[PDB]
Design a protein around this nucleic acid. Structure first.
Ligand SMILES: [Zn+2]
Ligand SMILES: [Zn+2]
Ligand SMILES: [Zn+2]
Ligand SMILES: [Zn+2]
Lengths: 678, 1289
RNA sequence: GACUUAAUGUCACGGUACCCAAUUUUCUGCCCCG
């Protein structure tokens, strides 16, 4: 016993304390660093005279360093790859330093195999499948088959079964082992014995187990990867696996409170897309019963709404969140620590919501979904008077190109991009021809749109029919918008007769609006600090906020209305503002100042209108882009004269059907939008 | 069908990349990022030579972009011929994709040709694109091309053999910084090529149509940017020296390794680098420093033997063998080689551990799923397009720093490891002619940061992108063009040094030293900016007015890379804005090429000689009208200016200038170099300052001790208070510091003062040999103080408790707990005050303006022998020894300086000092003094100690006196003990370090504990907890007058010969008899009367003349203490004033009776700053009595005698034996108005000598041998105090 | 002429070598017997 063995045994004690599941992560990050300090000191002392055991301990410590680095953003960080590369380069020296015991050769090949499996999962072109297959066959030749004592042998066996080599000799020891979880048993049955009944049973137990684990776990990623492989192999079980995994994800996500959040993991969207495709392929099959087909189209709408509820903030934005409201800050910190603890534990060991059919009479509801997997777009219509469901499909590529063209031209030449606006409206009318036919959307009905991602920015109410003298959509129907179906509620509070105005900016002038006497309450003011917003108390019938806006391009909880002494953000609206039950709100800021511009097809970014809807306001009327101030003053005066009249009448009267002769008046009319469903 | 010969000239350094074909390009990352650069191909093998070229497709894309812009300016027309909007889309089903895909927007216009273009007749745009040609996308013969771009070869003027890559390019590392954290995310590498020698390329363009020829010749001049540099397109008709120095550096390091002195090599490295600031004569005239008092040692560093000769002769020989490469390259090469060998050999330097390294990242390709997006952009018809040019100069307001990788770590051929070994020496970015350089990347990143602050919102920059970002910052930044700047200055930079401080021991940590290279302040760089657009923004005007300095407002351009220590604050001077109208004056822009490269002529041009079309711009908005200003840019950083008033000498060491500059000085103050712009050189006089890192660390220690955060051993992933204010390895700091500059240093005469110090051996009483040292501080006095002006900056977003912390740190610097510089325990650098300028924000003003007898009565029973006779017939001996035996108590739980503990005490004592006998404290800088040495040559005469004509006593004298008293009281070890050579009387036994017991040796290290004296006053590994200040004269008479004397002051003393320890140890037994003390008597009367006798009859080389002070003078001084227990404070207050009839001894002439002083404790203040408020008490008489009682009980407990009772009575110190002997040695007989006064004098050596005065038998012949007294009774007579020596007892 | 480009499509002026670390702790310019 020299001091090399004493220091190695101390470092091994520290690593065995770090491999314990009862340890919090903030202690693990210190324990691993102490152990690596001792071992790298021994290496700097005895550079090539080191035994194989210290090299094995260094490789294990670098595996722990690799699993303690959390991904930020949507990219695997380079620190993870650097840790796995250094561990491989350290254990290769113990492999090439021969003349040890056979047990130490077994241990070295086991550590090299698990580091290579993780590095092949992260990076593909650096560590390909052929190299991994050769290394794993070499590791299983040395006798790494003890399925009762180590679970890393189970991982090696299942990964080799996935890569395609025969493993029929080890099946009985694989099944009878009590370290294996149920996904590994289902993979073993399907890939070796070709038995689908036992695979079906073990996968059902796996999903019922997934109902209680957080979404930061490894098991979610592995399960969705198995369903993707089953769909690629043209099996007949991925249809039934996808729906159960979707149900488990819904029940697990239900537990969070009113602050709508979910953990970002990369295979969420492919799970919802495969569930949508499974229910759609069941629905297009012919059946003599029609009620089953109605139930399947309703299931499609439910999957779409459950995707559109939350918005999935990233990790660095969650770590940089401001500290206030010591109970809600406590809820957020509890959520974050639960997610990080589940992420590491996977690697160390192994009001009411309305029904979809609850709509007032004479209404028609249209849901949207953009399927990235098949590259298509689905529109789902519900009709209340006939009580029927239908759905149609369309393409979305050239629509995206025309929208990006209008975005660039607007951001340079705001009022002179009007011809590109007219071209975008004609393109919406050409790609989606179903909303002008009488079978899909009936004549004279009120339409509620629940859009998906880049359809949140398109003007759907100003589409033009693909004819010679085309008509607009707002000439026959009255349109309303909603971010998701979960934001709808009831009890439209029409209590008071109060009128309130607030105003902070003095660029576009509103003095003729300011001098009116209808703003007779003492709550009205023209300085507009945030505490002036948090002191309204008696639920006014109309509130009018007139200020500028500012958008945070990562965190939607930091988008602010530019009021006095710092403004008021999304989170402060959700925590502080109370007296707005059943209040029509008219914003003065445009939508382009409150949301950032999009650079991808998918975007989830909710403005302050959704926070005003969650506080309890009955409807926000806003501008989608920057209009002259005279139009906003005209809208506010028309709303004061008539609070019970619909917006599309005013859009038809003041020049909304003038796209042929004067595109500026058409630009100024169709900018206005109502974001609240009764 | 005629050909065109084209030249391409650069005006900035361009980029270079290696040539791969198409598929080997996809195998590499740097080649895929490095498209649209200049390509490099090798020649032969060995990868050392090759050639550079620019492809024709790159020039074709540049000309196509220029033609599109020119056709968009005139709405689709050029000289009356119209044109369609081309074609930029390719179908995949018919033909392949053209090997380079477009992501940006394309400009379009309303097509008014009304004839569809075909092969028969086509517009100029379709000819220049080459649609209706032959030879599409698979190459054939060079005919059947309507337009052809050939490759562009380097026009080398010495194309004789080959070009090396190291002779054209230079490697560099760029960066990407997060906006919130201030830290970098990733990095990447480029090759930058020289433009002064290798910047002309020559090619050939073939055209077969005139209809395109007019537009092509127009659009070759509109190209402004190629390969990363501004360009202009015209149409015409020593490794062997490194190897030798590396071998010699290995020889030097091996010699230093053999002499067991390796750690000096690091110091030596930077010493040689500092030699580039001097001439070569310092190695040829031997102007290096020498040992001031050497017999064998020589210098501390320049006289180490290397292969049988000294180091200075070795350096002279190495310079005599390498005269061809110059002096500067010689010094830099030898310093770099020494540092690299030291870093190789040291290896594990036990600093920050740093696993896992750092990350490169190049932007990933678009191989999956594609994007065939085509985005047309149409400007409106009556729009106006203009181009603005801003010219000016950039002036450094502080030192600056632009980082660079180490040379021999960035070689463009062969770039450069399981463990991580980070460097500790950093360099600055220079050009090839050794000129300073502000790179384009630093300016562009700073402009992006300030524009994101001014807009209020911006994105983080994404790299792998298919759609361009449409945030406002990116839209405005796609129109700004800058230009790299170089100075007209080539002098070498300065090296600035930094250490770390261990917070428990308050000493320096080993291996924590690092250094940077900084450039001078006052330098000027050129500055050009160009903006091409439709209207000039308000946010760019706000950033320009923020960077610009005027009267009152100073500049705020934080470029560079060490901003937390205040490095890289520039200002913008002499701005001029000019305007091009491109819709009417496009031909003059083409003719003058946009003044590219001629921007230096625009700064000196009058308004009359401007080119046609360029007008001055006069609608430039003022500072108090811009709304991005006053709301986002002005409240960002807030300034606090103040002035420190220091009333003590100030010493902040340099430690390299003491080894380079001549004068053999040990510790000298810190200086700077300042560039002036009236003339064009550095200023001849240098400027004294205290560095920014020093008072940054002062504020950090002051905050961390009150919050209690310095005790934590780890600071990664932390969110404590001092990691929020001062930052860590993950976040940048919120507080930025600048230097403290001396402002009143012109009303002094002889600003630097020489102060010399020595250590006194405890046994022999004289100076320990070869421990003399010197200091040269700045002369601070209590009536002429130093005034230092300083400044720091606070960021917006600070809470109330953090501002309370910073104001409490400022109040603690004002109160005097943190002295500046070195040697604070002996009184150097004590703050007397802080003044705050009236531009400071009002919250700091109110928060700083809101935080605004003892007698002992113990009388000692003196010795009976000088009290019974009272006729003065006895003669005593002047020095006696004290002997407590061997037991010393060593505590191993040492009190730390990490925090202010609650149970302990801290405060200050004000004391007054009164003289009972005359006092001599000499000013031993001036050896000639006051009396002329022309007459009686060799006669040393001195003056009293004075700083600026004010009589003072140094703090080191007071500290040594009280330390010797405390060590004799508390039974501590010998702190300063000379283990000298073998004592004689034949050669006797082992040396006198071996005569001493092992327990009384000095404390070395913190493992075996610390004695009470070393625990209170300090050691080499532990800072003390008491600080003694300088004493100022305040009252009383002065200048003891004597009649017949050339000054009326200035007594001439007797001889003072070295002490001989063979009188106390006169055999091989009879060990070291303890410490040595002197008695209190009036021998100065017999010196003063016999002046004429000793001015004659002695040799005047053995004598010393010095000024004296009379009895009755009052001095005043202060003692400051932190983290003390109750018994330590009690024993300290007892050791200051030990009662009536007890007094101390101080100064020169202690055997003759000079210098008996008495200290009275005037006041005692305490504070407990971890309470609710930082208060100050007064500590009345009862509490100090209880403290002294606690100290007395601790002393009884150490003695062990449990017979003495405990009670609330006054202590009697004479019940302990050694306290009784010590207080017998310090008893004054003439104070209680008794008529008796003793006679104290040495024997006079075998009479028939000079002073005998009677037949007294008081010679060393009779007191010497073992016949009148044996040896043991001599040691017994030396050991018992106040015993008579005539007659003997 | 090759080394050395492919042509109806190159935002690399698309990326600050950046972030943390008091040149200092200890020492009376002092002293009588061969
Ligand atoms: Zn054409
Ligand atoms: Zn951007
Ligand atoms: Zn901390
Ligand atoms: Zn000691």
């Amino acid at each position: 016993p020299t001091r090399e063995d004493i220091d190695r045994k101390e470092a091994e004690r520290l690593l065995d304390e770090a491999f314990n599941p009862r340890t919090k992560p903030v202690d693990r990050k210190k324990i691993i660093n102490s152990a690596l300090k001792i071992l790298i000191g021994l290496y700097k002392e005895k550079k090539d005279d080191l035994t194989s055991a210290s090299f094995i301990s260094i490789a294990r410590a670098y595996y722990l360093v690799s699993i303690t680095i959390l991904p930020k953003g949507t990219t695997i960080p380079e620190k993870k790859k650097e840790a796995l590369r250094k561990g491989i380069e350290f254990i290769d020296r113990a492999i090439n330093k021969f003349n040890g015991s056979i047990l130490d050769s077994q241990r070295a090949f086991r550590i090299k195999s698990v580091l290579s499996i993780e590095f092949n999962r992260i990076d593909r072109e650096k560590c390909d499948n052929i190299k991994l297959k050769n290394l794993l066959n070499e590791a299983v030749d040395k006798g790494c088959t003890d399925f009762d004592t180590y679970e890393w042998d189970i991982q090696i066996a299942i990964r080799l079964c996935e890569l395609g080599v025969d493993m029929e000799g080890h099946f009985d020891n694989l099944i009878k082992s009590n370290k294996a979880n149920d996904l590994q048993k289902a993979k073993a049955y399907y890939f070796i014995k070709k038995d689908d009944h036992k695979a079906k049973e073990h996968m059902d137990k796996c999903t019922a187990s997934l109902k209680y684990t957080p979404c930061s776990h490894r098991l979610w990623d592995e399960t969705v990867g198995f369903i993707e492989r089953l769909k690629g192999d043209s099996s007949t079980l991925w249809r039934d696996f996808a729906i159960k995994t979707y149900r488990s994800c819904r029940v697990q996500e239900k537990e969070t409170g009113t602050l709508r959040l979910r953990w970002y993991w990369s295979r969420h969207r492919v799970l919802y897309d495969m569930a949508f495709l499974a229910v759609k392929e069941q629905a297009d099959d012919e059946e003599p019963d029609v009620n089953v087909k109605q139930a399947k189209i309703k299931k499609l709408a439910e999957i779409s709404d459950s995707l559109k509820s939350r918005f999935s903030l990233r990790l660095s934005d969650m770590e940089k969140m401001p500290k206030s409201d010591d109970e809600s800050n406590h809820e957020f910190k509890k959520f974050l620590d639960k997610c990080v603890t589940a992420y590491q534990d996977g690697y160390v060991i192994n009001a009411k919501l309305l029904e979809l059919t609850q709509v007032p009479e004479g209404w028609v509801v249209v849901h949207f979904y953009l399927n990235k997997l098949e590259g298509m777009g689905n529109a789902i219509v519900f009709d209340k008077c006939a009580n029927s469901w239908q759905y149609k499909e369309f393409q979305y590529k050239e629509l995206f190109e025309v929208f990006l063209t209008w975005q660039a031209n607007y951001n340079l030449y705001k009022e002179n991009a009007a011809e590109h606006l007219v071209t975008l409206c004609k393109k919406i009318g050409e790609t989606m021809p179903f909303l002008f036919c009488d079978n899909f959307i009936p004549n004279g009905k009120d339409v509620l749109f629940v859009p998906h991602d880049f359809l949140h920015r398109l003007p759907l109410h100003g589409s033009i029919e693909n004819k010679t003298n085309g008509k607009l959509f707002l000439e026959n129907h009255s349109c309303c918008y909603l971010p998701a179906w979960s934001f709808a509620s009831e009890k439209e509070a029409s209590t008071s007769d109060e009128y309130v105005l607030l105003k902070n900016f003095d660029q576009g002038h509103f003095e003729t609006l300011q001098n009116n006497q209808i703003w007779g309450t003492q709550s009205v003011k023209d300085g507009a600090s945030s505490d002036d917003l948090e002191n309204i108390r008696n639920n006014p019938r109309l509130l009018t906020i007139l200020c500028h806006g500012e958008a945070n391009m990562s965190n939607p909880f930091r988008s602010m209305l530019k009021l006095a002494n710092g403004g008021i953000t999304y989170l402060e609206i959700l925590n502080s503002v109370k007296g707005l039950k059943g209040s029509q709100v008219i914003l003065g800021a445009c939508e382009t100042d409150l949301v950032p511009p999009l650079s991808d097809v998918m975007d989830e970014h909710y403005s302050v209108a959704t926070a005003l809807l969650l506080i309890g306001a009955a409807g926000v009327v806003g501008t989608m882009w920057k209009v002259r101030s005279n139009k906003t003053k005209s809208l506010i005066e028309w709303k004061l004269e008539n609070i019970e009249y619909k917006l599309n009448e005013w859009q038809k009267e003041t020049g909304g059907a003038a796209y042929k002769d004067h595109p500026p008046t058409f630009y100024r009319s169709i900018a206005f939008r109502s974001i609240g469903f009764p | 069908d005629m050909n065109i010969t084209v030249e391409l000239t650069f005006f900035e350094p361009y980029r270079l990349v290696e040539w791969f074909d198409w598929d080997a390009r996809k195998k590499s990352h740097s080649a895929m990022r490095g498209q649209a650069f200049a390509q490099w191909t090798w020649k032969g093998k060995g990868r050392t030579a090759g050639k550079s070229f620019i492809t024709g497709t790159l020039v074709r894309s540049a000309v196509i972009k220029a033609v599109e812009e020119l056709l968009s300016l005139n709405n689709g027309k050029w000289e009356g011929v119209p044109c369609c909007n081309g074609s930029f889309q390719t179908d995949e089903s018919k033909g392949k994709k053209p090997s380079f895909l477009r992501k940006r927007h394309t400009l379009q216009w309303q097509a008014n040709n009304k004839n569809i273009c075909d092969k028969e007749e086509a517009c100029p745009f379709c000819i220049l694109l080459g649609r209706f040609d032959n030879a599409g996308k698979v190459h054939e013969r060079n005919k059947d091309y309507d337009i052809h771009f050939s490759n562009f070869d380097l026009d080398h003027k010495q194309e004789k053999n080959d070009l090396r890559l190291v002779d054209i390019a230079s490697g560099r590392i760029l960066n990407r910084v997060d906006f919130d954290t201030g830290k970098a995310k990733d990095y990447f590498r480029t090759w930058e090529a020289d433009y002064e020698t290798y910047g002309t390329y020559t090619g050939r363009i073939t055209l077969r149509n005139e209809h395109a020829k007019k537009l092509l010749l127009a659009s070759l001049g509109f190209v402004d940017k190629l390969c990363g540099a501004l360009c202009r397109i015209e149409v015409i008709k020593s490794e062997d020296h490194n190897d030798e120095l590396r071998k010699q550096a290995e020889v030097i390091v091996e010699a230093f390794k053999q002499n067991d002195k390796l750690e000096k090599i690091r110091i030596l490295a930077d010493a040689i680098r500092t030699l580039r600031l001097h001439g070569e004569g310092v190695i040829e005239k031997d102007e290096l420093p020498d040992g001031k008092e050497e017999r064998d040692k020589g210098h501390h560093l320049w006289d180490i033997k290397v292969q049988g000769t000294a180091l200075r002769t070795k350096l002279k020989e190495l310079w005599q063998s390498n005269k061809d490469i110059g002096w500067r390259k010689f010094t830099e090469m030898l310093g770099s080689n020494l540092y690299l060998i030291y870093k190789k050999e040291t290896g594990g330097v036990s600093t920050r551990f740093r696993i896992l390294g750092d990350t490169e990242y190049y932007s990933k390709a678009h191989d999956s799923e594609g994007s065939d997006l085509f985005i047309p952009v149409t400007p409106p018809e009556g729009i106006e397009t203009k181009e603005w040019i801003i010219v000016g100069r950039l002036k450094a307001a502080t030192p600056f720093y632009f980082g660079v990788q180490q040379p021999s770590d960035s070689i463009p051929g062969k770039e450069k490891s399981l463990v991580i070994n980070e460097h500790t020496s950093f360099n600055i970015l220079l050009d090839k002619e050794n000129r300073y350089r502000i790179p384009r990347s630093a300016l562009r990143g700073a402009l992006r940061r300030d524009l994101r602050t001014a807009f209020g919102s911006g994105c983080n920059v994404s790299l792998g992108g298919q759609i361009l970002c449409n945030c406002k910052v990116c839209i405005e930044m796609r129109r700004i063009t800058l230009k790299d700047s170089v100075s007209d200055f080539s002098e070498p930079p300065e090296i600035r040094y930094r250490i770390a401080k261990n917070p428990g021991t308050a000493t320096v940590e080993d291996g924590s030293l690092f250094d940077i290279e900084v450039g001078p302040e006052g330098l000027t760089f050129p500055f050009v900016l160009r903006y091409r657009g439709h209207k000039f923004p308000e946010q760019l005007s706000s950033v320009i007015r923020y960077w610009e300095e005027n009267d009152g407002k100073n500049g705020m351009a934080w470029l560079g890379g060490l901003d937390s220590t205040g490095k890289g604050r520039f200002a913008l001077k002499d701005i001029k804005i000019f305007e091009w109208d491109l819709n009417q004056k496009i031909n003059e822009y083409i003719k003058e090429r946009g003044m590219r490269g001629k921007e230096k002529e625009l700064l000196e041009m009058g308004e009359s000689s401007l080119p046609d079309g360029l007008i001055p711009y006069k609608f430039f908005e003022e500072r108090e009208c811009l709304f991005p200003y006053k709301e986002n840019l002005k409240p960002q950083w807030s300034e606090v200016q103040y002035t420190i008033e220091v009333g003590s000498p100030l010493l902040t060491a340099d430690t390299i200038s003491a080894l380079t500059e001549p004068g053999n000085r040990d510790a000298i103050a810190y200086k700077k170099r300042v560039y002036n712009d009236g003339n064009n050189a550095i200023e001849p006089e240098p400027r004294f300052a205290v560095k920014s890192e020093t008072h940054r660390g002062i504020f950090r220690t002051a905050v961390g001790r009150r919050t209690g955060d310095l005790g934590k051993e780890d600071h990664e992933d932390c969110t404590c208070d001092m990691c929020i204010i001062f930052g860590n390895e993950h976040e940048s700091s919120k507080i930025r510091f600048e230097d403290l500059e001396l402002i009143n240093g012109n009303e002094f005469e002889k600003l630097e003062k020489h102060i010399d110090h020595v250590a006194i051996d405890r046994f022999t009483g004289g100076a320990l040999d070869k421990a003399k040292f010197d200091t040269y501080p700045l002369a601070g006095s209590p009536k002429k103080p130093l005034k230092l002006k300083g400044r720091f900056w606070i960021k917006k977003g600070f809470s109330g408790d953090h501002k309370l912390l910073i104001t409490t740190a400022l109040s603690d610097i004002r109160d005097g707990l943190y002295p500046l510089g070195s040697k604070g325990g002996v009184g150097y650098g004590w703050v007397a005050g802080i003044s705050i300028d009236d531009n400071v924000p009002d919250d700091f003003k109110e928060m700083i303006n809101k935080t605004e007898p003892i007698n002992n009565d113990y009388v000692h029973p003196g010795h009976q022998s000088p009290k019974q006779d009272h006729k003065n017939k006895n003669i005593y001996y002047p020095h006696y020894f004290l002997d407590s035996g061997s037991k010393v108590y060593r505590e191993k739980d040492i009190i730390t300086h990490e925090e202010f503990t609650e149970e302990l005490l801290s405060g200050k004592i004000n004391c007054k000092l009164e003289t009972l006998t005359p006092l001599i404290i000499p000013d031993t800088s001036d050896e000639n003094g006051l009396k002329l040495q022309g007459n009686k040559p060799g006669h040393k005469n001195y003056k009293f100690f004075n700083i600026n004509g004010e009589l003072m006593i140094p703090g080191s004298e007071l500290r040594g006196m009280l330390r010797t008293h405390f060590e004799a009281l508390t039974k501590s070890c010998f702190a300063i003990f000379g283990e000298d050579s073998t004592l004689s009387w034949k050669c006797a036994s082992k040396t006198l370090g071996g005569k001493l017991d092992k327990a009384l040796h000095p404390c070395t290290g913190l493992s075996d504990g610390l004695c009470p004296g070393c625990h209170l006053f300090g050691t080499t590994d532990y800072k003390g907890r008491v600080k003694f200040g300088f004493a100022k004269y305040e009252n009383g008479p002065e200048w003891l007058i004597t009649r017949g004397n050339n000054p009326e002051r200035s007594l001439t003393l007797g001889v003072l010969e070295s002490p001989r320890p063979a009188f106390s140890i006169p055999d091989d037994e009879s060990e070291i008899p303890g410490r040595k003390f002197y008695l209190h008597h009036n021998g100065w009367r017999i010196i003063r009367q016999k002046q004429l006798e000793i001015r004659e009859t002695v040799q005047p080389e053995r004598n010393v003349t010095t000024e004296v002070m009379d009895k009755g003078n009052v001095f005043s001084f202060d003692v400051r203490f932190e983290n003390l227990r109750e018994w330590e404070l009690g024993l300290l207050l007892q050791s200051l004033d030990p009662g009536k009839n007890i007094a101390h001894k101080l100064g020169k002439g202690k055997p003759y009776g000079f210098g008996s002083v008495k200290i009275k404790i005037d006041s005692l203040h305490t504070f407990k700053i971890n309470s609710n408020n930082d208060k100050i008490k007064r500590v009345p008489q009862s509490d100090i009595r209880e403290y002294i009682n606690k100290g007395y009980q601790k002393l009884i407990e150490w003695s062990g005698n449990n017979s003495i009772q405990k009670g609330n009575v006054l202590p009697q110190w004479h019940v302990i034996p050694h306290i009784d002997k010590l207080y017998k040695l310090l008893w004054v007989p003439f104070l209680n108005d008794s008529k008796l006064e003793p006679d104290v004098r040495y024997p006079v050596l075998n009479e028939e000598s000079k002073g005998y005065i009677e037949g007294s038998d008081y010679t060393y012949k009779k007191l010497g041998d073992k016949d009148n007294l044996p040896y043991k009774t001599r040691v017994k007579g030396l050991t018992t105090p106040w015993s008579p020596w005539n007659p003997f007892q």
